[PDB]
Amino acid sequence: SLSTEATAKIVSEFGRDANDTGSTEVQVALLTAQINHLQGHFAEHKKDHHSRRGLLRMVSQRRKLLDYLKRKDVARYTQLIERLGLRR
Amino acid sequence: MRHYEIVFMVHPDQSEQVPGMIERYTAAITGAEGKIHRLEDWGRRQLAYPINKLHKAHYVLMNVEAPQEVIDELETTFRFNDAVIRSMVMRTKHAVTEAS
Amino acid sequence: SMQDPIADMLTRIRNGQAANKAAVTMPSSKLKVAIANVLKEEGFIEDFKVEGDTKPELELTLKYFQGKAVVESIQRVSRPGLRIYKRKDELPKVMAGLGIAVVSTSKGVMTDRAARQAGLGGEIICYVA
Amino acid sequence: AVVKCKPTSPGRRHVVKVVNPELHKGKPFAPLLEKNSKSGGRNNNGRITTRHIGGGHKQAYRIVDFKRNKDGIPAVVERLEYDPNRSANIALVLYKDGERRYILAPKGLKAGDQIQSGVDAAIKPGNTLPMRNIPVGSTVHNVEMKPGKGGQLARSAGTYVQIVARDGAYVTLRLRSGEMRKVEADCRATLGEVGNAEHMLRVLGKAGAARWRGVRPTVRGTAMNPVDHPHGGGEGRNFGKHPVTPWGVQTKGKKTRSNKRTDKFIVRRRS
Amino acid sequence: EIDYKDIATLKNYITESGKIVPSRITGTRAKYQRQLARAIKRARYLSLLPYTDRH
RNA sequence: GUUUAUUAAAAACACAGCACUGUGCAAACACGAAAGUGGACGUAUACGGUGUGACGCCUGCCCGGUGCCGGAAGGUUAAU
RNA sequence: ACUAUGGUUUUUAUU
RNA sequence: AAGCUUGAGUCUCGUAGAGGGGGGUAGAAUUCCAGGUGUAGCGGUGAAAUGCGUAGAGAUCUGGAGGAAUACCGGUGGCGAAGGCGGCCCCCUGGACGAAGACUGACGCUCAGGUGCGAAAGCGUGGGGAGCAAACAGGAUUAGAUACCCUGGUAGUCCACGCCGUAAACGAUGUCGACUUGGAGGUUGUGCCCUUGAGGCGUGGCUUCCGGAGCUAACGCGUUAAGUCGACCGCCUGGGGA
């Protein structure tokens, strides 16, 4: 679950072709917005351990994509964490 | 848009007290500058089983077409009310005119 | 996950000749057509033929003998977790000359028989009987 | 909150303190404070009339409007702060024309909330109305026992009362102590639960910390001689008699209620 | 499919005791049965259909 | 930390705490027959009475006696 | 078919 | 050093469910308090006694409350990884499935130690506590009865929060993925058929029963394999002592 217009907001910024999501920079920006939308259910107390497993899965997906991106190109990594709140 | 039917049942002799509350049951929506789709009765009816020792009651529904961040105020709207015996919410379903 | 392109070819051969299939097909490659030309003239398949040029495929016609497959065992041995290299006499004897070992070599894909006849060695692909 | 302590002298590491960072740490509203000098548990001409009470620290008393003078006047909650005369914390209420009073606190900690008495007043907790206009099962906050007499019952941290029946002119309360009794439906209720609710999680730490909370020691009656306290007995450590008050009467299980005025309004009582 | 403002259509899927009839009888199958159950359980709590039965 | 000031400074006394119990506010209760006052201008997360005394691990048997609480019919039984 | 119920029988010889 | 994509994924438009969490509040039945009608029994069993009974029980009619647990629908019907999930509501939220089009491109798998996850019992601590009931008393059974039987009854069972990681953990079989002859049924998408048929013909995901090849002392697995292969990591080494 993510707000209905919010996927297209990533295409309207990290995308470079209409309605396109093949970019790993779009995937990491979308996963970051999805993690933020899921932190709306947390940021308080640990009771939902099941929905927290899916949170750790998308946090691991972002970490697994960043490992692949750091192995691809260091500038494409550095310029992604320049537009997103990573290594704050 | 967010939708809720907001149907409630009142004590039959307190049906004379409901027109004094015709802006009070909607006070959560008027306080949000909105206006409900209906706020209309569904007549007086006999009960299939008796609730709080009543056997015939009067029915009203609102169709609020209003956001989920005042649905807790629509809970308090009935919490301290003496004229109701039961309310129910029925989420989504949309809202339309005629035929209740 | 999907781990090996040759197991996806050898399973079609081994299980297809157990299930009496006429001809079996998989994605092509330079290596896959090199071993097909050995397995053909060593009499382990009845035909091989390619299909396409962009996302290319290879079809192998299976060979039968006395109501069973012509092959008694086709074994990998040389696999992603362990590759095997064999020198000109270090080459093993597969089923006392009733089977072959297949070698890649720097000089073309061939049998250990042809490698001995050339004083040659290399990496193993498979052992067939 | 509540939070643990840290040791400065042996020992305190497992002690707990309440801590409420949403209350204003500033100064009480001065027109409502009285000297309220201590009496040491000793009456006008005494001699002790209540034991163990003695010592300070010095403390002014804050005048609260439990009587809720005037009716239907619009107000706002300007401040929420702690009060050491009590335990549920206090609210500073500001009426529309600049009148300020201290009033018994809600469960809420958000300030600027607009509050008024009435029945066409918003249905929310904190807006006070007569119990003739509310349904059964409701939590009523602090209430008056006679119309216009002012707030008694459920004034301590997180405490409340519930109305469990109503008929004609009267309403039945259920008390958390195990009591159940009637009051007149002309009596005012503020609805919901009172402030703090954490006070029972505190554990003080060290004997001296009570000495500035109006406490002094007094020796065990069982440790002195029977001329002094009647619980005293020769050689001690084996009494051979029932435990008693300082006047030689039972001190386990003996009931003492003798009011006879308010009892015909009661349905059920504390065990 | 969800509403309580007609019981003349809901009567076909219940008994005299107000019990819900299993989908293997009424040709509803599980998917539409689970919808009719919601209309009935709403109409129950509004006292438009019998809930419990003793006689 | 306290104590027999002037033969005992302690293992006794006190204590956060722990337990048992009273108390619906004109509280319980004290001194006074009362006048008042203190408890308290506090309100069961508050106050009174008593015992027990960090903590950890545990904690069998007994209602004959002595006091309390409830059951309320009946018995012994006053003024009348 | 299901009474309401009971614990226990020294050792060893076909080679 | 550089292309390519089949691997893997997402997006547009859609599909389904007792997956989890936060906060509300409702359908009845043990049971007990209180009154009308009413009278000598009720409870247990092979028999019984303790116990409840004129202190008016049980039975009936009615008024009422705390707390635990939620019939039908409900199924070859579903979800979760596993523990586990089936009162209902409102809010919040995890993972899974399809068509066609497209983009990115090896982004995919596994894993000593470590981390998160615990049915029940037990424990930290307060609150609750109708009922069920480990301790146990009283009664009864019996050779005995500290157990099985009857009446009670403490802990615990319920909640918030913290500990404890256990199992006949069960679809017993590590995790991920390829490969192979045939049939029928269940479920649900999608594409197609005036659907003018809960039905068909393609085609995916889930699921159920035979069964060809293979495996297995033997039962049994058999496309959701115990078969044949590709990667990674645990566990084992005769019984007893233990």
Swiss-Prot record, chain A:
InterPro entries: Ribosomal_uS15, Ribosomal_uS15_bac-type, uS15_NS1_RNA-bd_sf. GO terms for biological process: cytoplasmic translation; regulation of translation; ribosomal small subunit assembly; translation. The keyword Ribosomal protein applies. GO terms for molecular function: rRNA binding; small ribosomal subunit rRNA binding; structural constituent of ribosome. It comes from the Bacteria. Pfam families: Ribosomal_S15. Induction: Part of the metY operon that extends to pnp, also has its own promoter. GO terms for cellular component: cytoplasm; cytosol; cytosolic small ribosomal subunit. The keyword Protein transport does not apply. Keywords: Ribonucleoprotein, Ribosomal protein, RNA-binding, rRNA-binding, Translation regulation. CDD domains: Ribosomal_S15p_S13e. Belongs to the universal ribosomal protein uS15 family. Part of the 30S ribosomal subunit. Forms a bridge to the 50S subunit in the 70S ribosome, contacting the 23S rRNA. One of the primary rRNA binding proteins, it binds directly to 16S rRNA where it helps nucleate assembly of the platform of the 30S subunit by binding and bridging several RNA helices of the 16S rRNA. Binds to its own mRNA, stabilizing it 5-UTR and preventing its translation. In the E.coli 70S ribosome it has been modeled to contact the 23S rRNA of the 50S subunit forming part of bridge B4. In the two 3.5 A resolved ribosome structures there are minor differences between side-chain conformations. This is Small ribosomal subunit protein uS15.
From Swiss-Prot, chain B:
Keywords: Acetylation, Ribonucleoprotein, Ribosomal protein, RNA-binding, rRNA-binding. Binds together with bS18 to 16S ribosomal RNA. 5 different forms of the protein, varying only in the number of C-terminal glutamate residues, were isolated. The sequence shown is form bS6-6, which is the longest. The first two Glu are encoded by the rpsF gene, the other Glu are added post-translationally by the RimK enzyme. The keyword Transit peptide does not apply. One of its GO terms (biological process) is cytoplasmic translation. GO terms for molecular function: mRNA 5'-UTR binding; small ribosomal subunit rRNA binding; structural constituent of ribosome. The chain holds residues 1 to 100 of 135 of the full protein. Signal peptide: none annotated. The gene is rpsF. This is Small ribosomal subunit protein bS6. The modification N6-acetyllysine is found at K93.
Swiss-Prot record, chain C:
The keyword Membrane does not apply. Signal peptide: none annotated. GO terms for biological process: cytoplasmic translation; regulation of mRNA stability; regulation of translation; ribosomal small subunit assembly. PROSITE patterns: RIBOSOMAL_S8. GO terms for molecular function: rRNA binding; structural constituent of ribosome. One of its GO terms (cellular component) is cytoplasm. InterPro entries: Ribosomal_uS8, Ribosomal_uS8_CS, Ribosomal_uS8_sf. It comes from the Bacteria. Gene3D superfamilies: 3.30.1370.30, 3.30.1490.10. NCBIfam families: PRK00136.1. One of the primary rRNA binding proteins, it binds directly to 16S rRNA central domain where it helps coordinate assembly of the platform of the 30S subunit. Protein S8 is a translational repressor protein, it controls the translation of the spc operon by binding to its mRNA. Part of the 30S ribosomal subunit. Contacts proteins S5 and S12. Belongs to the universal ribosomal protein uS8 family. This is Small ribosomal subunit protein uS8. It comes from Escherichia coli (strain K12).
Swiss-Prot record, chain E:
It comes from the Bacteria. One of its GO terms (cellular component) is cytosolic small ribosomal subunit. One of its GO terms (biological process) is translation. GO terms for molecular function: mRNA 5'-UTR binding; small ribosomal subunit rRNA binding; structural constituent of ribosome. The keyword Transferase does not apply. Keywords: Acetylation, Ribonucleoprotein, Ribosomal protein, RNA-binding, rRNA-binding. Binds as a heterodimer with protein bS6 to the central domain of the 16S rRNA, where it helps stabilize the platform of the 30S subunit. Part of the 30S ribosomal subunit. Forms a tight heterodimer with protein bS6. Belongs to the bacterial ribosomal protein bS18 family. This is Small ribosomal subunit protein bS18. The lineage of its organism: Bacteria, Pseudomonadati, Pseudomonadota, Gammaproteobacteria, Enterobacterales. The chain holds residues 20 to 74 of 75 of the full protein.
